[PDB]
């Protein structure tokens, strides 16, 4: 995020880091339960990538992180790679995340909830903060 | 990539308003946010856009696409969860 700020550590508990086997972060995700993660379909996750939970500082080695294996990748079949529409994939964990003070789930909305233009929300992540 | 976790509060926009910036690339299962001085950028993809509702953070959007430049004057585009939750639920249900 550009123009962002540092979050309080562990304050967005559902926030997960998707990392390749090399350990390089390439995409974010959100735990919706102890067994499933929601992410963007275009991230192109595979069974070889890893779901990391409870992380704040990726440079730290003292964090009690949770490296979770990916059992199966459920790419929304309405996803359109040409147009990036329906960009959602579900990742089922092969090992359940252990919920805690720093690892918990985001709430999901009803199909009909209204979220008004003008409302101030929050987005988080480890993406570039400079382009 | 930065080492520690970042965040930013930003406004939701109407699809109709978005389209003044991204035309027809904007679909019903997408929701726009930003153009307010911060922007989602490479590496943020798949991450969340949440809103507070009845005091609980709720996944309204998933970081999808935006400025090739991460411009903070252009809005970010997010997958719209409301349009996706039905599939989310069937998927959990059968797996």
């Amino acid at each position: 995020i550009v123009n962002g700020e540092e979050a309080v550590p562990g304050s967005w508990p559902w926030q997960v880091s998707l990392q390749d086997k090399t350990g390089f972060h390439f995409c974010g995700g959100s735990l919706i339960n102890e067994n499933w993660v929601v992410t963007a379909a275009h991230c192109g996750v595979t069974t070889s990538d890893v779901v990391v939970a409870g992380e704040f500082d990726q440079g730290s080695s003292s964090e009690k992180i949770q490296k979770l294996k990916i059992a199966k990748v459920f790419k929304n079949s309405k996803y359109n790679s040409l147009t990036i529409n329906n960009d959602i994939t579900l990742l089922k964990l092969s090992t359940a995340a252990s919920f805690s003070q720093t690892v918990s789930a985001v709430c999901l909305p009803s199909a009909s909830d209204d979220f008004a233009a003008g409302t101030t929300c929050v987005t988080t992540g480890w993406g570039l903060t400079r382009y | 990539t930065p080492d520690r976790l970042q965040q930013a509060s930003l406004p939701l926009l109407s699809n109709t308003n978005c389209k003044k910036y991204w035309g027809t690339k904007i679909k019903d299962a997408m929701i726009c946010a930003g153009a307010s001085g911060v922007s989602s950028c490479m590496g943020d993809s798949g991450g969340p856009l949440v809103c507070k509702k009845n005091g609980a953070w709720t996944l309204v959007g998933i970081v999808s696409w935006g400025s090739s430049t991460c411009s903070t004057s252009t809005p970010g585009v997010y997958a719209r969860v409301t349009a996706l939750v039905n599939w989310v639920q069937q998927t959990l249900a059968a797996n």
């Binding site: 309080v8 562990g10 304050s11 919706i32 918990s104 789930a105 | -």
Partner: peptide, 10 residues
């Protein structure tokens, strides 16, 4: 869901 144990500060 949706209520962190550690409160976010924005």
């Amino acid at each position: 869901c949706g209520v962190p144990a550690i409160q976010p500060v924005l």
